[PDB]
Structure 1
Amino acid sequence: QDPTIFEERHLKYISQLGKGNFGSVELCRYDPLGDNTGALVAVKQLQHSGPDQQRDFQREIQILKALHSDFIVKYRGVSYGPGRQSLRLVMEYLPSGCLRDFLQRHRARLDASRLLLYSSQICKGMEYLGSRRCVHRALAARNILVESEAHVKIADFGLAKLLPLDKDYYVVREPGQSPIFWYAPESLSDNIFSRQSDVWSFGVVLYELFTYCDKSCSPSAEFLRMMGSERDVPALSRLLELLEEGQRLPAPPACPAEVHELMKLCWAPSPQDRPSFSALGPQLDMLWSGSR
């Protein structure tokens, strides 16, 4: 039978890789021989899951299984067993971890060339998603994995959703918890998501890259600075005002002028004024290839 069914009894828990409110990703060994020689895999499972979370998890599985890109984390299979909440998503395990941590650890040896390479790879992964009409909704350096020092892959499809065939956006109900500083203003204000709201998020990823995810100039830190001595204004309320005024994150010192221009375009107020990933990719490819 298919290599995509992993027997539950053979999955041996090792450690946690990620957690959210409704699920976790765990490092596990798939060990059918029982001698601790099996492959390592990353396994997602739900906790505190109601029907809605279970239904979304089914969606996540079917999306990831259908993606075949060098820049998207690889689906391996599922597992299940008796009773409920036992459905698991098995993926490849990337021991180098996430790009956010990699940039903070290795900042001093990673030049603008390499950051341009990462940006171009992430953009290609998002172009691939765009062609399949998938809105990722969690594009952030913490969800990008390092396959090797010159190869990254997009992960965390827990919020990903397909566009309908007849509409280029979708709307959610006022959900659980969003990373407000990565989200498009229409997403924040009206729960509208699209490929173009992902582009806005990509701009914030470029900002992360070219600050090396430094905590002192994180988006949240920059927001707090953009706050005058008013500390008790709800962040979301104030962010939305700042964005409406045309305020945006500053150009990082490591950031070439061309990349800053691309960030600014990713953050166009109107989603239809934002470039597609297919337009951004050649620009970043030119900049990467040119700095080699």
Structure 2
Amino acid sequence: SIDRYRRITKLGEGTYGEVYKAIDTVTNETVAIKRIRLEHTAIREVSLLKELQHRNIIELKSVIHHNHRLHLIFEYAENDLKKYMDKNPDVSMRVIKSFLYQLINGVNFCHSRRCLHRDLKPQNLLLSVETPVLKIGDFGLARAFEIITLWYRPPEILLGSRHYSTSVDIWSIACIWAEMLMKTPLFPGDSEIDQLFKIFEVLGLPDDTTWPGVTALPDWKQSFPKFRGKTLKRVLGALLDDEGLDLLTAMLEMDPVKRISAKNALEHPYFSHNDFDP
């Protein structure tokens, strides 16, 4: 029942429909309500997301399906990463590494329950009140139901693969991480092919050794330029220690099956030094 929620105040339009903040008069807490525009099992699917209870995941508190309208009630977070990086240019390396750890930790929690995000970006990395706590929003919604979307999309998707795996989210994490360090997007494409080009420009053009099966993907072009790769070292090696570089490189393997897992990323030596807040 939506009648529980008062002072419902529109915040803007999201991916799925209108987004609001509200007061939950049963708990006194502020919540976010997301109107999910449909028309084209869904309630079951979305309801399973309620089990994703983790400090680095925006909690799905309630699914309300009434008068043939669908609202999701979520935990409220006052800030998000894009806004936060805009407002905080001098933010420390320690905050950046904490945000990264926290993102990977959330992601690993979800992947371990067979839940993929598929559309990670700084805009759904919400921040809640020394360091804010990073909480990922909208896990599982891309499934269950603007050029910026492209910037965090992995090459297997851009090349037209039908198989989304956990590796998709790992790619996106690496892109977000690079952006936090560089203050501009790593691969700021303006089309799916321009996007691939931006990726190939840094990482090199794949072949059937570096990425077995790549040339059979639907949108592969035998005419792609034979990019050698600027290399990540050259692009951002100045901003990152050697350990950080090795992690980032592992997350940006172009073949999704070679891309590091969230779990192995959390085990990487980069996070063994107590120089961040989990």
TM-score range, shorter chain: 0.7 to 0.9
Q: Letter of the aligned partner of 1:39 in structure 2?
A: E
Partner of 1:114: 95
Dislocated runs of 4+, deviation >4 Å: 55-58, 175-178, 246-249
Which residue of 151, 156, 161 maps to 1:181? 151
- Distance of 2:146 and 2:85 partners within structure 1: 29
Partner of 2:85: 103
Asked if 1:140 corresponds to 2:129, the answer is: no
Partner of 2:3: 9
- Distance of 2:262 and 2:102 partners within structure 1: 11
- On the 8 A contact 2:152/2:172 being kept in 1, the answer is yes
C-alpha displacement of 1:259: 2.0
Asked if 1:218 corresponds to 2:212, the answer is: no
- On the 8 A contact 1:13/1:28 being kept in 2, the answer is yes
- On the 8 A contact 1:144/1:153 being kept in 2, the answer is yes
Unaligned runs of 5+ in 2: 206-226
Q: Deviations over 1:188-208 (max 9, x none)?
A: 122431101211111101112
- Distance of 2:65 and 2:28 partners within structure 1: 19
TM-score in terms of structure 1 length: 0.73
SS in 1 for 2:33: strand
- Distance of 2:147 and 2:72 partners within structure 1: 22
Partner of 2:166: 195
Give the % identical residues.
Answer: 22
Partner of 1:50: 39
- Distance of 1:290 and 1:8 partners within structure 2: 44
C-alpha displacement of 1:185: 0.7
- Distance of 2:77 and 2:260 partners within structure 1: 31
Q: Letter of the aligned partner of 1:236 in structure 2?
A: E
Query: How many residues matched?
Result: 245
The equivalences for 1:163-178 within 5 A come to none
Asked if 1:25 corresponds to 2:3, the answer is: no
SS in 2 for 1:50: coil
- On the 8 A contact 2:175/2:185 being kept in 1, the answer is no
- Distance of 2:276 and 2:139 partners within structure 1: 32
Asked if 1:267 corresponds to 2:252, the answer is: yes
Partner of 2:68: 84
For residues 241 and 102 of structure 1, do their structure 2 counterparts lie closer, same or farther at Cα, with a shift above 3 Å needed? Answer: closer
C-alpha displacement of 1:27: 0.6
Unaligned runs of 5+ in 1: 1-6, 163-174, 224-233
C-alpha displacement of 1:270: 1.1
